[PDB]
Amino acid sequence: SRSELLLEKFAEKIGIGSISFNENRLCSFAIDEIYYISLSDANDEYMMIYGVCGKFPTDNSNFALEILNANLWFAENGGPYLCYEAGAQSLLLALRFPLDDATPEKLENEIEVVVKSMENLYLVLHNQGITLENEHMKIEEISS
Amino acid sequence: MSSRSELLLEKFAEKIGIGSISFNENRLCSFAIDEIYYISLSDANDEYMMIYGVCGKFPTDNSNFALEILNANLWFAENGGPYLCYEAGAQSLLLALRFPLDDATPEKLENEIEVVVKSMENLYLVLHNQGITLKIEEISS
A11: domain CATH number is 1.10.287.390
Please give the DSSP secondary-structure letter assigned to residue A136: -
Residue contact B63–A64, C-beta within 8 A: yes
Structural domain span for residue A104: 33-137
Residue contact B84–A71, C-beta within 8 A: yes
Residue contact B77–A75, C-beta within 8 A: no
Residues of A in contact with B97 (CB under 8 A): 75
User: What total number of domains does chain B contain?
Assistant: 2
Q: B55 and B3 share a domain?
A: no
Contact between B45 and B120 under an 8 Å Cβ cutoff? The reply is no
Q: A23 and A43 share a domain?
A: no
Residues of B in contact with A38 (CB under 8 A): none
| DSSP-assigned states of every residue in chain B | ---HHHHHHHHHHHHHS-------TTS--EEEE----EEEEE--SSSEEEEEEEEEE--TT-HHHHHHHHHHHHHHHHSS--EEEEETTTTEEEEEEEEE-TT--HHHHHHHHHHHHHHHHHHHHHHHTTT----EEEE--
Q: How far apart are CA B129 and CA B115, in angstroms?
A: 21
Q: A115 and A63 share a domain?
A: yes
Q: Given A61, A71, A94, which is nearest B74 (Cβ)?
A: A94
Q: Which helix (H) or strand (E) holds A89?
A: none
Q: A82 and A92 share a domain?
A: yes
Q: B82 and B141 share a domain?
A: no
* Shortest Cα–Cα distance, A125 to chain B (Å): 18
The CATH number of the domain holding residue B121 is 3.30.1460.10
Q: B96 and B75 share a domain?
A: yes
* A–B interface: beta-carbon pairs under 8 A: 91
Q: Given A42, A58, A76, which is nearest B67 (Cβ)?
A: A58
Q: B47 and B115 share a domain?
A: yes
Q: A28 and A41 share a domain?
A: no
Q: A105 and A83 share a domain?
A: yes
CA B11 vs. chain centroid, Å, equals 28
Q: A53 and A19 share a domain?
A: no
Q: B18 and B56 share a domain?
A: no
Q: A2 and A57 share a domain?
A: no
Contact between A77 and A113 under an 8 Å Cβ cutoff? The reply is no
Closest Cα partner for B72 from B63, B62, B82? B82
Give just the sign of the alpha carbon dihedral B10, B16, B20, B21: negative
